[PDB]
């Protein structure tokens, strides 16, 4: 049974929304719980100058101290990360404890991850080559890709269902043929063509 | 101003778009409207899916229901976005491109996809873009819709290489010091160090970006 703790300054964003079949426990934590000042400050100007802000190490350090254990896998979504793939989702789906640290894309002070890595496994990962303001949406994607793999190539080609004719377009007759070896071969070719057209990187 | 309509059988799930988020609505730069696909059903049990022709696992969303929905929501100026693992890649360039659009409609699908005729039909009157946000599988297009909205909206007027490590105060923490060059005020040496750190991180984490083989 899996535990997922998410830490964010936008807890409402990650409020689950009604799969509660008691398979996984997901807890969301407001990062401001661990701030030190009356202003509940979570970021500060970057050393070396430049735009935006960097999230404070003292605040994140306290949060992870309380939430993480030696058994924890710490997930840090960031555009500067290793790629998050289906292989990753599969690996993480058998973990007991995931902690996802959501930060603004300018980043969390690197000493946070570096320190955590001396006591637990840390994975900095990117869900894609685009920039988001913060890690929250990436966290939703990771949570969904991982949890759907918990009990309870080529591209896929087009799919079809009833009715057999709709707005002048017929379902490919082969799909209604009852020749299942031929259907497989047809689907294989559709996958080849679609992969060539949309994702030539997948063919080498 | 921009208009985004999202069509889904899980409307409440597109609540994370709301107030305390970059998803901008409050500043009146975009209006985001979420529609329950089941609004366009007519049968008692509000059915939106059916078993696939030709066999296979799962269900396929019916064309009839999606057709009526898109008839009501789209115009010929609409950019129809269909998140799918079989889509063209959604990239930063895509985000910049869509940031200048007047009207995005995002069709969120579940099970094993939407009957292909829906996208084919729509393309006879509007521009259609089937896209993938990444090489992982989600149950449905909803989370991908949130990602796309976040990536696009932060580029709207009025709102290469990997970024290396960043630091802020204090300059020493748990016996770990900020790199001294970052404290030196030498803009040229700081730029050089950051450039270097970025290329070290890219070669390690994303060698593909520099034209090398992936692990
Ligand atoms: N692409 C991203 N942008 C911001 C935060 C996280 C991200 N990611 O890909 O995991």
From TrEMBL, chain A:
Reaction(s) this enzyme catalyzes, per UniProt: guanosine(37) in tRNA + S-adenosyl-L-methionine = N(1)-methylguanosine(37) in tRNA + S-adenosyl-L-homocysteine + H(+)
Name of this chain's protein: tRNA (guanine-N(1)-)-methyltransferase
All residue ranges annotated as the tRNA methyltransferase TRMD/TRM10-type domain in the record: 2-203
NCBIfam families: PRK00026.1, trmD
Gene behind this protein: trmD
Cellular compartments annotated: Cytoplasm
GO biological process terms held by the UniProt record: tRNA N1-guanine methylation
Gene Ontology cellular component annotations, sorted alphabetically: cytosol
Residues reported to bind adenine: 127-128, 130, 132
Record-level Gene Ontology MF annotations: tRNA (guanine(37)-N1)-methyltransferase activity
Residues the entry annotates as binding S-adenosyl-L-homocysteine: 77, 103, 126-128, 130, 132
Binding annotation for S-adenosyl-L-methionine: 77, 103, 126-132
Annotated function: Specifically methylates guanosine-37 in various tRNAs.
SUPFAM superfamilies assigned: alpha/beta knot
Xref: CDD domains: TrmD-like
Keywords from the named record: Cytoplasm, Methyltransferase, S-adenosyl-L-methionine, Transferase, tRNA processing
Subunit structure: Homodimer.
Gene3D superfamilies: 3.40.1280.10, tRNA(m1g37)methyltransferase, domain 2
Its EC number(s): 2.1.1.228
Organism: Mycobacteroides abscessus (strain ATCC 19977 / DSM 44196 / CCUG 20993 / CIP 104536 / JCM 13569 / NCTC 13031 / TMC 1543 / L948) (Mycobacterium abscessus)
Family: Belongs to the RNA methyltransferase TrmD family.
Composition bias, Basic and acidic residues: 189-201
